[PDB]
Amino acid sequence: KYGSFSEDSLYSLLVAELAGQRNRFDIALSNYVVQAQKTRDPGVSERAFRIAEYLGADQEALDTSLLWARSAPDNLDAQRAAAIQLARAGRYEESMVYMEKVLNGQGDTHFDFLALSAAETDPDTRAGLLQSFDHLLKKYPNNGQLLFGKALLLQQDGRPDEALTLLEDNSASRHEVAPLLLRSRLLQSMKRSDEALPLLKAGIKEHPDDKRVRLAYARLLVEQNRLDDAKAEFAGLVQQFPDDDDLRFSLALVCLEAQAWDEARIYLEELVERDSHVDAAHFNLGRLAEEQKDTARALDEYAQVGPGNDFLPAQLRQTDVLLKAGRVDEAAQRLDKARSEQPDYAIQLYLIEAEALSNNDQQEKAWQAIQEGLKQYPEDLNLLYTRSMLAEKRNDLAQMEKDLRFVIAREPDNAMALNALGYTLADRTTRYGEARELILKAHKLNPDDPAILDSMGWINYRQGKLADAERYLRQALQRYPDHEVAAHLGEVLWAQGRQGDARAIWREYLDKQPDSDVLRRTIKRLTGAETP
């Protein structure tokens, strides 16, 4: 029942196909568009449309979509694509025609696909499509599917209020699954969970079949800190769909949030034996073991799994829980084994080892670990940055400067390295001009990051200027409040003269981080007391 090629139809196509693998896509476009224009067959037109959309050129893509819709119009997806392309081209009435083509078919009549396609479109094309949709709704206001599509487009625009009003107006939206899903999404985007949860449970009871409604209800409960209700609902879901690994994984997460460690680890072991989502299960198991009695079992679930991208956070949790348990040597041995398993993962394993050992205050063990990781692979900039941080914790300031300089040489674009080097030079150099140049490069690379602003303020203080340092440190603090930035601001105020505000801000940030020691050292050295 297949068709039959012609002499030249099989010629051009072949070239196009061959060109499609020599990156000479233009020839493919020419051949496919010509053969779709003349042959009219569905498959050729569809291939032409896909190629045209891939390359980007749209006018010929618009023509190809029109032809494909004309070829086998029963394929409603082609009709939808042609309508979207027409909306992009601004027909605005033939787009409506193709809408009534795809719409009104009464077979899986779907506008979620249209919303997903429009998600990537530009706001102007989206606005044109929404105007066409409004005209259609005025023509076709009876069904709630039209309202659902219009509300989807409105949400894509960024104005959910009118969409939510439209959803509330019609009861069929409540009776239909998709419109109530949409109203839940709008309420979530409206920052009103108190209204989302009740309507969510109303949807659950009205349509218990749909698991998404209740899953989102539990998610909103978690966001609302109603952890017990979310845990119970997720247990009910696992009862409804025990085959679902993700549902039981979320149940384990919510149970962890509900400090019910026993059931949390039980669900994590259910995931492990189901051999799905096991790496996140292992991360959760390590967290639980940190918050639960035993840890050897957690090491066991960590070990029984193979390499995994999401296992790397799990491996970090394993290292941290081992450090908490006190057997640092076992963590080092496991990390060495993992490094032997894969060198690409070995670099990250060395990084995590150094960072975790630094966190537990073991600066020298972290330093030797990062030195190892650099001796297997000194090219990595992350390893050098970690060694620089460890040196700063160890006052090996020359090593920190060397590592930061090498990282900057590798990746000058990275603003964090420039900021670190500038701060180090400013703190450990009599002339701050080069430090100021480095900090300015970091600023022009990243002028908004709180650390960049903090370093700019510190270098300004060392330079001697006062107002710029004040403003930049205030910017850093409002971006993110930190005790070190507070100490820098206090130094700036010491330069300014208004010591009262320095004392007040120091008190505030010591309340923020009483355990901070750099802030207390600054207060002691300037105001003469540990606290002001």
Binding site: E17, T39, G43
Partner: protein
């Protein structure tokens, strides 16, 4: 108004690129496409082949008549070069070769890979030159066979007066001018028997084939009415039909034709016509069944193809190529001055049949 199978073409392009990527040798697209076309032709109809440009030039004129060959003919089947018929009066025929045997190795190389064209090209060689073949017969084990290659004379048809009442006319190969030799042989036989014979036996067995024109001529020489053979094919020019001529030096003598199963094409055409018009009767075994016609097809370039344009048809609805012509009586060959009749069992059976039917006819 039907789906165009673009998927197959896309698959072919992907395969081409993947092959150009993965092969060990740096191989240009030219060789890839050439091999593609070669196999496209070969795997479809075994006889068909891609007559290349220099191959076409060679086919335009014979390179030299010096080289002869082993005389035998082959037809591709299951990828093995099998011997359809060892032409009579040839070392291969004289040597221990039986039609229906398979050639495995020729000149020290296997044949399961190439096509019958290459095997035939290898077979021919310098005159008076030895050669070796490894032939597996009827499932037996391979055994070396040494043969001498030399230019061969066929002599076409021989007529022997097997008995005073009967003449045994033998056709070796359907060369050109075979019909006139048959006609003059029949005239000589009439002269010997004073212008009346009691029947004829045409032992057109162990005969590969030849030019269709000679076959039509002889079938006319024995016949007067009806279509001798018609051809069918897709191309418009395919349809080629022949007929019968009132002239017949046969004198309406009864005929019995033998088909040992080592006969192909032209011989099959003649036998099928002679039974379809009920002019005669058959007594050998089932034929080899090859009636495909090959015609050279020029292309856009100087090159040309050799696709099987049309397959033959006997005057009835029967098709030679599909099933091969069958005899109304089956008599397995065997052995039982001396006359050739006493030697070959089928000939004795045929002569006895003519003797028995002579009285039935009366005069």
């Amino acid at each position: 108004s039907a789906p165009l199978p673009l998927d197959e073409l896309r698959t072919f392009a992907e395969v081409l690129d993947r092959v150009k990527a993965a092969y060990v040798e740096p191989v240009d697209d030219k060789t890839l496409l050439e091999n593609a076309i070669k196999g496209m032709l070969s795997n479809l109809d075994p006889h068909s082949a891609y007559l290349g440009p220099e191959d076409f030039a060679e086919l335009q004129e014979s390179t030299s008549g010096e080289f002869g060959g082993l005389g035998i003919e082959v037809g591709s089947e299951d990828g093995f070069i099998k011997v359809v018929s060892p032409i009579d009066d040839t070392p291969a025929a004289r040597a221990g070769i039986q039609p229906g045997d398979l050639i495995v190795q020729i000149d020290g190389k296997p044949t399961k890979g190439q096509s019958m064209t290459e095997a035939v090209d290898s077979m021919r060689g310098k005159a008076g030159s030895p050669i070796t073949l490894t032939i597996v017969r009827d499932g037996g084990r391979p055994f070396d066979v040494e043969l001498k290659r030399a230019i061969i004379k066929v002599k076409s048809v021989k007529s022997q007066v097997l008995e005073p009442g009967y003449a045994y006319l033998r056709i070796t190969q359907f060369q050109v001018n075979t019909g006139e030799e048959v006609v003059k042989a029949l005239n000589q036989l009439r002269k010997d028997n004073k212008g009346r014979l009691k029947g004829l036996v045409l032992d057109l067995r162990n005969n590969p084939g030849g030019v269709l024109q000679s076959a039509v001529e002889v079938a006319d020489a024995f016949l007067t009415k009806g279509l001798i053979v018609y051809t069918k094919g897709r191309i418009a020019n395919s349809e080629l039909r022949f007929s019968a001529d009132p002239a017949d030096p046969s004198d309406k003598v009864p005929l019995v034709v033998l088909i040992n199963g080592g006969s192909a094409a032209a011989a099959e055409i003649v036998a099928g016509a002679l039974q379809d018009q009920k002019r005669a009767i058959l007594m050998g075994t089932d034929s080899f069944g090859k009636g495909s016609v090959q015609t050279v097809l020029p292309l856009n370039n100087d090159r040309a193809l050799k696709l099987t344009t049309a397959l033959y048809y006997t005057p009835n609805g029967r098709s030679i190529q599909a099933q091969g012509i069958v005899p109304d009586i089956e008599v397995g060959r065997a052995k039982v001055s001396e006359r050739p009749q006493d030697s070959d069992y089928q000939l004795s059976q045929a002569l006895s049949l003519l003797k028995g039917l002579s009285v039935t006819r009366g005069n």
